[PDB]
Design an enzyme around this catalytic site. Structure first.
Site, PDB file in Angstrom:
ATOM      1  N   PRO A  41       7.914  15.380  -0.102  1.00 41.69           N
ATOM      2  CA  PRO A  41       8.523  15.675   1.410  1.00 41.69           C
ATOM      3  C   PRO A  41       8.271  14.630   2.268  1.00 41.69           C
ATOM      4  O   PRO A  41       7.223  13.610   2.200  1.00 41.69           O
ATOM      5  CB  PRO A  41       7.466  16.665   1.752  1.00 41.69           C
ATOM      6  CG  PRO A  41       7.011  17.573   0.596  1.00 41.69           C
ATOM      7  CD  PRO A  41       6.836  16.324  -0.465  1.00 41.69           C
ATOM      8  N   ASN A  42       9.138  14.462   2.954  1.00 39.73           N
ATOM      9  CA  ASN A  42       9.147  13.210   4.263  1.00 39.73           C
ATOM     10  C   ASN A  42       9.266  14.228   5.307  1.00 39.73           C
ATOM     11  O   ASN A  42      10.575  14.888   5.615  1.00 39.73           O
ATOM     12  CB  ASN A  42      10.151  12.289   4.130  1.00 39.73           C
ATOM     13  CG  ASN A  42      10.351  11.612   2.684  1.00 39.73           C
ATOM     14  OD1 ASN A  42       9.450  10.844   2.416  1.00 39.73           O
ATOM     15  ND2 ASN A  42      11.105  12.197   1.786  1.00 39.73           N
TER      16      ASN A  42
ATOM     17  N   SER B 112       1.639  13.682  -1.651  1.00 40.81           N
ATOM     18  CA  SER B 112       3.038  13.624  -1.764  1.00 40.81           C
ATOM     19  C   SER B 112       3.812  13.697  -0.350  1.00 40.81           C
ATOM     20  O   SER B 112       5.054  13.041  -0.388  1.00 40.81           O
ATOM     21  CB  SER B 112       3.567  14.614  -2.703  1.00 40.81           C
ATOM     22  OG  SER B 112       3.636  15.844  -2.223  1.00 40.81           O
TER      23      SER B 112
ATOM     24  N   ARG C 138       4.782  12.571   3.254  1.00 35.44           N
ATOM     25  CA  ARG C 138       4.776  11.617   3.870  1.00 35.44           C
ATOM     26  C   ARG C 138       5.277  11.959   5.481  1.00 35.44           C
ATOM     27  O   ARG C 138       6.206  12.511   5.494  1.00 35.44           O
ATOM     28  CB  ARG C 138       5.810  10.241   3.492  1.00 35.44           C
ATOM     29  CG  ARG C 138       5.486   9.355   2.258  1.00 35.44           C
ATOM     30  CD  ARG C 138       6.570   8.623   2.355  1.00 35.44           C
ATOM     31  NE  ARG C 138       6.814   7.961   1.031  1.00 35.44           N
ATOM     32  CZ  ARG C 138       6.469   7.178   0.257  1.00 35.44           C
ATOM     33  NH1 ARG C 138       5.256   6.431   0.881  1.00 35.44           N
ATOM     34  NH2 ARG C 138       6.738   6.662  -0.837  1.00 35.44           N
TER      35      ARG C 138
ATOM     36  N   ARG D  38      10.170   5.304  -2.021  1.00 38.15           N
ATOM     37  CA  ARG D  38      10.985   6.501  -2.032  1.00 38.15           C
ATOM     38  C   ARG D  38      12.273   5.911  -1.792  1.00 38.15           C
ATOM     39  O   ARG D  38      12.679   5.813  -0.332  1.00 38.15           O
ATOM     40  CB  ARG D  38      10.619   7.749  -1.083  1.00 38.15           C
ATOM     41  CG  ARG D  38       9.467   8.500  -1.687  1.00 38.15           C
ATOM     42  CD  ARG D  38       9.057   9.489  -0.816  1.00 38.15           C
ATOM     43  NE  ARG D  38       7.711  10.078  -1.294  1.00 38.15           N
ATOM     44  CZ  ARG D  38       6.947  11.016  -0.804  1.00 38.15           C
ATOM     45  NH1 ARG D  38       7.495  11.664   0.265  1.00 38.15           N
ATOM     46  NH2 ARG D  38       5.855  11.361  -1.348  1.00 38.15           N
TER      47      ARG D  38
END
Lengths: 71, 62, 63, 71, 72, 64
Positions: free
Chosen positions: F1-2, F37, F39, C39
């Site tokens: 999303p992080n 999705s 993290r 990412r």
């Protein structure tokens, strides 16, 4: 409000305590943020993990490693 | 040293300038870093995106 | 792996697009991570908010 | 104690409120951090700005742009 | 100009130095940033501290912990 | 999303495992993101490096 610091490993506990006080004072004095709201996070980056101009800090003789040892 | 400060929206550009200056000088004084090595930037957070105790700053202010 | 790059505002979408792919490829091409796991995002900082040696980029660019 | 969220622009203000509330509850309920200490910061990244597996989010038809509406 | 990398602990010094070089090259080559001003911050996360689909990397048998030790 | 959570050093591995899972589930439910999705990771801070009101968590702890 929230202040995040990254810097090469090797600072002492007293320098970290001083930096936290001085960054907090700076936020309170400059913009009037309430002291109790100010958070500061310091993250030590080993000299093996920080790049300057494409090179590691350890390869430039700077900093200490993860166990506090100089190059 | 890299200093990222998250601030809620609402400060003037002149407050932001004084903040980056005061954060820089605080670092110089506290850890003896040379001023030109210090990077300070501000990340501005909308009040709808800044939570304290589970409530947004916008909701708190309302 | 997560790659966050702070850039001063000013770049165009196309510059950004090519930066993202290059950072991804560079990561895949450096350590061998699966490309699907990488990412990358850019955080653009207004010039009024990013300081070098204590001065904002906006202030430096006043003359 | 400090939670930073990074995610693609496009979420509604109600979704952001929900997420701040739920992440705070998780911190409080799981490890007993006091509610008033929990800070949550949400960062919206435009889709021209966020890469999945090398391609931008916009390239893949996801999220919105820095102006607020995109394909 | 500032590149922050977060990834599971376990990579070697040489992998890191390769990454630092590669990311710095990619930035200069793509948008012409001064090489002398590119900073790369690598953030090792212990496998006990990193989540994949809600499960720790250590539970999945990946990376190392804060003492540098594999999940074996 | 992080999701990055800064925590003071001191939580057990079981607590950290529980926290990573609960932050992930909170994210799935609040915004409807698929779990694969999301993290989540913790950034652990020694108590001498986490400041509140200009004081370190270590000094606050040592002051009862």
């Amino acid at each position: 409000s929230i202040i995040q610091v990254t810097f090469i490993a090797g600072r002492t506990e007293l320098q970290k305590e001083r930096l936290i006080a001085a960054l907090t004072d700076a936020a309170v004095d400059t913009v009037g943020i309430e002291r109790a709201e100010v958070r500061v996070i310091l993250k030590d980056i080993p000299n093996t993990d920080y790049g300057i101009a494409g090179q590691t800090a350890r390869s430039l003789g700077r900093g200490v490693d993860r166990h506090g040892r100089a190059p | 040293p890299n200093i990222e400060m998250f601030v809620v929206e609402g400060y003037s550009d002149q407050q932001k300038e004084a903040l980056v200056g005061a954060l820089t000088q605080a670092t110089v004084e506290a850890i003896g870093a040379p001023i030109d090595s210090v990077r300070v930037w501000l990340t501005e957070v909308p009040a709808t995106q800044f939570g304290i105790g589970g409530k947004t700053v916008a909701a708190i202010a309302a």
